[PDB]
Structures are given as structure tokens and as C-alpha cells.
Amino acid sequence: VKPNYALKFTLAGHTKAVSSVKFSPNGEWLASSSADKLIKIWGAYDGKFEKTISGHKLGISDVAWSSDSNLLVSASDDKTLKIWDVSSGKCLKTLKGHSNYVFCCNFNPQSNLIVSGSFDESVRIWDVKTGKCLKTLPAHSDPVSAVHFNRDGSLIVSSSYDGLCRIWDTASGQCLKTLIDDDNPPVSFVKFSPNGKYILAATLDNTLKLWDYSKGKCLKTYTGHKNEKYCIFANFSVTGGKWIVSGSEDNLVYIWNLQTKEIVQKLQGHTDVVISTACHPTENIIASAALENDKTIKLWKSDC
Amino acid sequence: VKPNYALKFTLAGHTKAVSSVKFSPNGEWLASSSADKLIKIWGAYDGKFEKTISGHKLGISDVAWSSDSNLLVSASDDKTLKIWDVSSGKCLKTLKGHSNYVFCCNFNPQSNLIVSGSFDESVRIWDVKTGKCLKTLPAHSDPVSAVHFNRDGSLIVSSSYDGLCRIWDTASGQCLKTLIDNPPVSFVKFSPNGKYILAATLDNTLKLWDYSKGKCLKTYTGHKNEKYCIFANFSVTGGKWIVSGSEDNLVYIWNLQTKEIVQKLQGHTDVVISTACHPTENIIASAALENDKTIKLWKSDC
Ligand SMILES: CS(=O)(=O)c1nc(NS(=O)(=O)c2cc(Br)cc(Cl)c2O)cn1C1CCCC1
Ligand SMILES: CS(=O)(=O)c1nc(NS(=O)(=O)c2cc(Br)cc(Cl)c2O)cn1C1CCCC1
């Protein structure tokens, strides 16, 4: 069994490299962010452009949705995050405190907190309602590439170019676990697995690894794509077959069998690095986005 | 201070009346049961359907979570209770012994015991590990409408259409107290601090009792409850509220101390038979009978 993702729509509009794509939790929308300082909202099923959201003063590296799909948070090189009302496009709050580019962000499942990571090497936890910074974690000794909450919000995982992944207790701010090897290439992405027991980490040795972080054991590796430079998102695809999905610096989307690690599909069409992919929450749909020779988002659909 | 619960999601999927909704202790999930013989699991923050759990041969009246959120127990008209692994959906044990419909169930905080009540007028205490019945208590003289453990599991409270609430010692099975006009008692549970019980009677009244002193400290009224066993709850995450469904299709919310109705949630199109309060967020789940068949999730700032 292999998926058969086929191209359905190409979405143009951004005027610099795209940086992130995310489907809303209710399945209805895709949000994209770009170095052009904009967020764009698109229909998830037909690619229809819905709106542009503007106000950051420099490029945007990441965007994340609240669980009720009503809010977005964005992380910008202007050293802020912004919380947006998706329906109106209005900026509700500007989150100030990082001292350099904000690279990654996420809401907790409860969506009362936002976590952010920055080039300033810190991880910050923010109150959604007030916009205030609740905690600053001295998390890493180099830029922070990803931050993600687990399924009950009680943990955060962070990754950094310092080579580490760390697990944090949300409520206390304490580091519960550091994952480190004899060799520690930059970690360019991390997230919790669907069941919360694993983390999937990308390193710039062209490799994805699935770790049991409690036991400190690497269960699976996914290779054959190209990733030595950019922070490229990876995903778990849960709607049909159990796949790992990632972009790649050879302009393809790679899809692997979770268990066997075999590459099961490569999606061809983009004309630059595929910096970001997202998997739809209920349908077998992938969104992919590329850097500045391309500047487009593609929507792909599969039977499994 | 008054809450401002607003509708966030409507969860459709059951094909007959919903009978109970419960949040998992870790806050991640809502479990629902229905007369359609199914349990459904839903995401607590995005309302997304997760899975259906099936195997009972007749409708289900109640479902309850273990304290690690890994197991469910369900009580059915098929006269059995089933213990389920939530991750796999598999039935681990079928608890056999009641001679009629099983109406209510709960784990203790340690989650090594389950308590059940039945139309057979008994309360049973079951070993989770083996599924064996440990004790049968001749608890009531009419159907048992609710059973609940206190904060550490040392006590059980039961209620019945016979008009009584009874407090039982878990370890010994002995009745420590009987609270005795005697309208049918359609629901009971211990308060968060274990010192009170909140009891619903089919005279449209919720009462908060100090059961050790035999004193009724508060009543909550203004809703409609003369027929169904409607759950009620203590809301501990924001303001101190009592929450209940109602036979006029609304969710009622009262101030614990003043007994004032502070909000009524409108949206359901049938009796709101069950409500649940999320363990850490100000989120209510409500569920309704068969003209409606949906669960609604509501969110408040306090
Ligand atoms: C193969 S397996 O199906 O047995 C399995 N499930 C998990 N859990 S996971 O990574 O969180 C997860 C990933 C996806 Br993609 C989808 C879902 Cl639903 C999901 O739960 C891991 N594995 C195996 C690989 C490593 C241990 C055995
Ligand atoms: C008003 S009060 O705050 O003084 C108060 N607390 C309790 N304890 S309770 O019922 O277990 C309880 C209920 C809720 Br709802 C939430 C929490 Cl957290 C909680 O602990 C009772 N009362 C008063 C009602 C009658 C006696 C005085």
C-alpha cells in the first residue's frame, strides 16, 4: 500500500518565499506565511483565496492556529508575535519580549497559551488573553528552530541549531529531558507524535528520526530526501495510511511508510526548495510550499 | 461574577439519544454514550471525532474514565458493564452479575475498583484487574440512579428512585448513613472536597447536603427535572458554579453560594440529559435526547 497524491491546485499570491503552511483544525482553511510580511488564508478544499492579513514589519517564519480555528499566531523577524482574529483579519495582540527574530510558534491544545522560539536562543510562553509573557526559558545556546506542545499541553518540545532537543514542563518551565548524542548536528525541526510518546526530529544531516524521548531510543529514521540547510517542517499523516511527510531541498515532497521507513511517494512540481508541508486533519490532503524561485503553495489529494 | 459560556462546537454522530458525556481526567478527550449502543470519543478542544467503541448488545446509560485516562467503563441495558482500552477500542473485560439494566458506573481514584448501580436495586463493586464482582450491596428498593466515589475512594454514595441517598464504606460495604417527603432521587455525587453530596430529585430541585450532619445547606432550582436522570456537576476551574441539564432543553448554571441562576445555555432541541465540566478549562459539554442527539461544547472566561 502506497498513497497516490496527485496535484489538484496551485495557489499563487505571495511575492517572496513562502515560509509555512498550516491547515486549520476544523479543516476549512489553509494559512500561509511568507518573507513578504503577509499571511494568506485559502480554502482548504478548493484553494480559493480568502484574505490577506497584514501588519508585521518584517518577514514571517511561522503561523499557528488556535484549536477553535478562530485565532492565528504568527512569528516574525520584527521580533514580535502577533495574535490575529481570522474572521476580521485584525491584530488582537502584539507579543513583545524576544530580542531577535521569532522563528517558530504554536498554541497549546487549550489555546490559552502560545509558545515561541527565537534566534535569541530562548523559548517564551505567553498568555493568549492578555498577551503578556508568562515565562522565558533559557532553552538553548543557538537559535531555536521549533517548539510544540504535546496533546494535553503539559509538555513542550524545543529544538535548536545547538544540536539538542529538550522536553519542558509547561507549568513550571523546568527541563525534564535533553536528547544529545556523541555527534549533534543542528536540529532544524521537532514535534510530538500523534500519541504523544515520540518526537520526530529533523537534523541537517539529511535525516528525520523518531525518538522515544522517555527512553532515549531512536526507533526509526527516514532518509533519502535533501535537508542540509533549511528548517523544513515534517508531518505525521494520520487520515489514511500512516505516513511521514516532509519537504526537501531537491524541490520534492517525500512520503515515507512510518513502520518500514521506505519512501512510498515523491511529489514533483515545485521549482524551489519545499520549505513547508501540512497534512489535512480529516482528509488525505497535503499542502506544500516553496522558496523564492517558486513562491507557490500546492494542494495534493490521495486515496489513502 | 457571572460566566459567559458561548457555543463552540456541535458534535453529531450518535443515532439515538445521548445518555452521558464525560471529560477524560487529562482534559484531552470527551467520551459519550448513547442508546445507540455506542461510545464515541471526541477531541475536547477542537470537537473532532476520534473513534467509535462498540460491543454492547443494547443501549448504554453511562460511561466513566480511569484516572490515567487510559480505560473507560460503560453500563448497559444488556445487564453488563464493559472495561475498554481507549487507545485500541478493545473490550478488556465484561462485568456480569446484575440481573437488570446497569444504569450508572464510576471508577475509584486509584482506578482499581469500579462501582455500578442497576435497575435490579443493587450496587456492585468490581475488581478492575480481573473483572470479578467483589461485593453486591442490597442498596435500595428501586432502581439505582447514580453511584460515585469520594475524593480518595474511601466512600461510595448511591441514589435511587426509592427516595434515598446512602453513604457506603468502600472497604467493608457497610452503609454508614441514609438520608431520608421522599421524591425519587435521580442523581447524586460527592462535592470536590468530599464533605457534601449534591443530589437531584424529580421535584425540579438540586440539594447540597452535609451528609454527616444530615443538613441541607443549599438548594438550586428554576430548571425543569421531573422525569429523567439528569447529571449535575460542580464547576471548579473558574467561578464556583453548579451546572445541570434540564427538561426545557437548557443548561442551567448557578452560583454555589447565593444559589442564583447565573446563566442558561440555549441551543439544544431536546432534554439536556447530561453535562460535564472540563477538569482544567472553563468548558462545559452538554448532551441531549433523541430530537437532538448532539453534544455541544461551550467555553467561558470564568
Ligand atoms: C506502526 S504503528 O502503527 O504500530 C505506530 N504508531 C505509532 N504511534 S505514532 O508515531 O504516534 C503515529 C504515527 C502516525 Br503517521 C499515525 C498515528 Cl495514528 C500514530 O499514532 C508508532 N508506531 C510505530 C513506529 C514507531 C513505533 C511503532
Ligand atoms: C462557597 S465556598 O467557597 O465557601 C464552598 N466551598 C465548598 N466546597 S465544595 O462544595 O466542595 C466546592 C464546590 C465548587 Br462549585 C468548587 C470547589 Cl473548588 C469546591 O471546593 C462549599 N462551599 C459553600 C457551599 C456550601 C458550604 C459553603
Swiss-Prot record, chain A:
Pfam families: Beta-prop_WDR5. GO terms for molecular function: histone binding; histone H3K4 methyltransferase activity; histone H3K4me1 reader activity; histone H3Q5ser reader activity. It comes from the Eukaryota. The record marks D77, F103, F233, E292 as: Important for interaction with histone H3. There is a cross-link at K16 (Glycyl lysine isopeptide (Lys-Gly) (interchain with G-Cter in SUMO2)). WD repeats lie at residues 13-52, 55-96, 98-138, 139-178, 182-223, 226-266, 269-303. The modification N6-acetyllysine is found at K82. Keywords: Acetylation, Chromatin regulator, Host-virus interaction, Isopeptide bond, Nucleus, Repeat, Transcription, Transcription regulation, Ubl conjugation, WD repeat. GO terms for cellular component: ATAC complex; histone acetyltransferase complex; histone methyltransferase complex; mitotic spindle; MLL1 complex; MLL1/2 complex; MLL3/4 complex; NSL complex. Its main location: nucleus. PROSITE patterns: WD_REPEATS_1, WD_REPEATS_2, WD_REPEATS_REGION. Changing L291A: Abolishes histone H3 binding. Changing Q259A: Reduced interaction with RBBP5 and reduced ability to stimulate KMT2A methyltransferase activity in association with RBBP5 and ASH2L. One of its GO terms (biological process) is negative regulation of transcription by RNA polymerase II. Contributes to histone modification. May position the N-terminus of histone H3 for efficient trimethylation at 'Lys-4'. As part of the MLL1/MLL complex it is involved in methylation and dimethylation at 'Lys-4' of histone H3. H3 'Lys-4' methylation represents a specific tag for epigenetic transcriptional activation. As part of the NSL complex it may be involved in acetylation of nucleosomal histone H4 on several lysine residues. May regulate osteoblasts differentiation. Interacts with PAXBP1; the interaction is direct and links a WDR5-containing histone methyltransferase complex to PAX7 and PAX3. Interacts with HCFC1. Component of the ATAC complex, a complex with histone acetyltransferase activity on histones H3 and H4. Component of the SET1 complex, at least composed of the catalytic subunit (SETD1A or SETD1B), WDR5, WDR82, RBBP5, ASH2L/ASH2, CXXC1/CFP1, HCFC1 and DPY30. Core component of several methyltransferase-containing complexes including MLL1/MLL, MLL2/3 (also named ASCOM complex) and MLL4/WBP7. (Microbial infection) Interacts with herpes virus 8/HHV-8 protein LANA1; this interaction regulates the MLL1 histone methyltransferase activity on viral DNA. This is WD repeat-containing protein 5. The gene is WDR5.
